[PDB]
């Protein structure tokens, strides 16, 4: 499903994000909880206020996971093995929540990098985030 063209756009887009990946990851979470309050059920004992240490910390861990997924895009299921067990088996997260997270992430990337966020790159990122969502929501 992910073509060579899609993989090229993912690396380039996530590459131009680079150092600010952890910042956009945290921003995407804060944008998700405010927009979709049903997402907060998975984080009961968490500080979900504006400029929280937990959200900034968790956003970095999500960004590092995405960076790991981008680096090993040709073999995602093996790369995100532990996270698949965590989200699918243990947490039992509904796949619908991943569409809401990626929605907020793509909006964040569009804001901070307008010129770089072309329709072709936008298509590839959504296609990339969809495939990473299927790996995490699936059981092995």
């Amino acid at each position: 499903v992910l073509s060579p063209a899609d993989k090229t756009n993912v690396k380039a887009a996530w590459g131009k994000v680079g150092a600010h990946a952890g910042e956009y990851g945290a921003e995407a979470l804060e944008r998700m909880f405010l927009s979709f309050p049903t997402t907060k059920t998975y984080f009961p004992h968490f500080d979900l206020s504006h400029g929280s240490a937990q959200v900034k910390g968790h956003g970095k861990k999500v960004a590092d996971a995405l960076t790991n997924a981008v680096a090993h895009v040709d073999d995602m299921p093996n790369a995100l093995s532990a996270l698949s067990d965590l989200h699918a088996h243990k947490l039992r997260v509904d796949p619908v929540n991943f569409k809401l997270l990626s929605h907020c992430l793509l909006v964040t990337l569009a804001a901070h990098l307008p010129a770089e966020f072309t329709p072709a790159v936008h298509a590839s990122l959504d296609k990339f985030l969809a495939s990473v969502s299927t790996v995490l929501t699936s059981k092995y």
């Binding site: 992910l2 993989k7 090229t8 756009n9 996530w14 680096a71 040709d74």
Partner: protein, 143 residues
């Protein structure tokens, strides 16, 4: 002129063997002009690289993914163009291009001038990428 897009089209290297002989794993970093992480290459080039020993000079093998998009890929040693050659290629969806080139003893960092292109659109040039090995390379004839 000898781009990876067209180089991988040779069916002789459809899945050719390239792991025979003595080698050593060598870690490295891919940095830009400002000595900061060159991200596109970081995601593309596999770390650590295999360094195959020979009788004369050690040949470093670089595993480059999404070869179908990679156009230009020139490697320089102290501002001198090294002879790069395609040894093997994994087809899509893997799309990995394995290329080898010789490196003289004591060489710790190399200069990589390269470019990418999707089918026939905007050619994204990468004028300077700095490959820096964790240790200098040294060939071992005794293996």
């Amino acid at each position: 002129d000898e781009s990876l897009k067209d180089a991988i089209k040779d069916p002789a290297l459809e899945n050719k063997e390239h792991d025979i002989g003595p080698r050593e794993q060598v870690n490295f970093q891919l940095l830009d002009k400002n000595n900061e992480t060159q991200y596109y290459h970081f995601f593309s080039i596999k770390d650590p690289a295999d360094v195959y020993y020979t009788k004369k000079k050690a040949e470093v093998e670089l595993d480059i993914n999404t070869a179908s998009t990679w156009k230009k890929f020139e490697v320089y040693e102290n501002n001198q163009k090294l002879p790069v050659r395609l040894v093997s290629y994994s087809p899509v969806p893997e799309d990995h291009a394995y290329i080898r080139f010789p490196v003289s003893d004591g060489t710790q960092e190399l200069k990589i001038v390269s470019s990418t292109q999707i089918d026939d659109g905007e050619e994204t040039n990468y004028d300077y990428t700095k490959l820096v090995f964790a240790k200098p390379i040294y060939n071992d004839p005794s293996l």
